[PDB]
Amino acid sequence: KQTLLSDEDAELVEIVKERLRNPKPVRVTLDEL
Amino acid sequence: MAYFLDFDERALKEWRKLGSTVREQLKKKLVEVLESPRIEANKLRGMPDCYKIKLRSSGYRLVYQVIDEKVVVFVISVGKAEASEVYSEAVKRIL
């Protein structure tokens, strides 16, 4: 089949977990963006 | 919106540093996930709670996490990250 996920994901996992430990989420909507 | 929208503080600044039309594309890809965010096709490799959306032509991407407890799409990363030049440039410290 081959995966839809790839070697890009290998980088995205380190970025997400990095910020995840202390990102500070701000509650918004798309209309206000 | 079924799911609410949340953004990482760094990610707020991330959309500001990229093209205006680029962020709007991401926003529309967000309105659809805010209805149904579990797009298993776009799942990340390692984090089952996270998915990646990407812009076919623009080359930018967005990574979000689906928080069911708080019912919110929490975008963690916005901008360009990739596979290609990650290998090409690789490092800048220890060769």
UniProtKB/Swiss-Prot annotation, chain A:
Disruption phenotype: Essential, it cannot be deleted if a copy of relE remains in the cell. Cells missing relBE have a higher steady-state level of translation during amino acid starvation than wild-type cells. They survive antibiotic treatment in log phase better than wild-type cells. Cells missing mazE-mazF survive hydroxyurea treatment better than wild-type; further disruption of relE-relB and tonB yields even better survival. Induction: By amino acid starvation, by glucose starvation and by chloramphenicol; induction is independent of ppGpp. Autorepressed by RelB, RelE acts as a corepressor. Member of the relBEF operon. Operon induced by ectopic expression of toxins HicA, HipA, MazF, MqsR and RelE, but not by YafQ. Signal peptide: none annotated. Probably degraded by Lon protease during amino acid starvation. Degraded in vitro by Lon. It comes from the Bacteria. A number of site directed mutants give rise to a delayed relaxed phenotype; RNA synthesis resumes 10 minutes after amino acid starvation, an unusually slow recovery from periods of starvation, accumulation of a translation inhibitor. Belongs to the RelB/DinJ antitoxin family. Dimerizes and binds DNA via its N-terminus (residues 1-50), binds toxin RelE via the C-terminus (residues 47-79). Tetramerization probably requires amino acids between residues 66 and 71. Homotetramer formed by dimerization of dimers in solution. Forms an RelB(2)-RelE(2) heterotetramer. Also forms an RelB(2)-RelE heterotrimer. The RelB(2)-RelE complex is probably the one that binds DNA and represses transcription, possibly as 2 heterotrimers, 1 bound to each of 2 operators. Antitoxin component of a type II toxin-antitoxin (TA) system. Counteracts the effect of cognate toxin RelE via direct protein-protein interaction, preventing RelE from entering the ribosome A site and thus inhibiting its endoribonuclease activity. An autorepressor of relBE operon transcription. 2 RelB dimers bind to 2 operator sequences; DNA-binding and repression is stronger when complexed with toxin/corepressor RelE by conditional cooperativity. This is Antitoxin RelB. It comes from Escherichia coli (strain K12). The lineage of its organism: Bacteria, Pseudomonadati, Pseudomonadota, Gammaproteobacteria, Enterobacterales. The gene is relB. The chain holds residues 47 to 79 of 79 of the full protein.
Curated annotation (Swiss-Prot), chain B:
It comes from the Bacteria. GO terms for cellular component: protein-DNA complex; toxin-antitoxin complex. The active site is at residues 52, 81. GO terms for biological process: cellular response to amino acid starvation; mRNA catabolic process; negative regulation of translation; regulation of DNA-templated transcription; regulation of growth; response to antibiotic; single-species biofilm formation. InterPro entries: RelE/ParE_toxin (IPR007712), RelE/ParE_toxin_dom_sf (IPR035093). The record marks 54, 61 as: Transition state stabilizer. It is an enzyme of class 3 (hydrolase). Induction: By amino acid starvation, by glucose starvation and by chloramphenicol; induction is independent of ppGpp. Autorepressed by RelB, RelE acts as a corepressor. Member of the relBEF operon. Operon induced by ectopic expression of toxins HicA, HipA, MazF, MqsR and itself, but not by YafQ. GO terms for molecular function: DNA-binding transcription repressor activity; endonuclease activity; ribosome binding; RNA endonuclease activity; rRNA binding; toxin sequestering activity; transcription cis-regulatory region binding. Pfam families: ParE_toxin. Belongs to the RelE toxin family. There are estimated to be 550-1100 RelB and 50-100 RelE molecules in rapidly growing cells of MG1655; as they have quite high affinity for each other (dissociation constant of 0.33 nM) there is probably less than 1 free RelE molecule per cell. The RelB(2)-RelE complex has a half-life of over 70 minutes. Forms an RelB(2)-RelE(2) heterotetramer. Also forms an RelB(2)-RelE heterotrimer. The RelB(2)-RelE complex is probably the one that binds DNA and represses transcription, possibly as 2 heterotrimers, 1 bound to each of 2 operators. RelE occupies the A site of the 70S ribosome, making extensive contacts with the 16S rRNA. Its presence blocks access of tRNAs and translation factors. RelB bound to RelE prevents RelE from entering the ribosomal A site and thus inhibits its endonuclease activity. Toxic component of a type II toxin-antitoxin (TA) system. A sequence-specific, ribosome-dependent mRNA endoribonuclease that inhibits translation during amino acid starvation (the stringent response). In vitro acts by cleaving mRNA with high codon specificity in the ribosomal A site between positions 2 and 3. The stop codon UAG is cleaved at a fast rate while UAA and UGA are cleaved with intermediate and slow rates. In vitro mRNA cleavage can also occur in the ribosomal E site after peptide release from peptidyl-tRNA in the P site as well as on free 30S subunits. Seems to be a principal mediator of cell death in liquid media. Implicated in hydroxy radical-mediated cell death induced by hydroxyurea treatment. This is mRNA interferase toxin RelE. It comes from Escherichia coli (strain K12). The gene is relE.
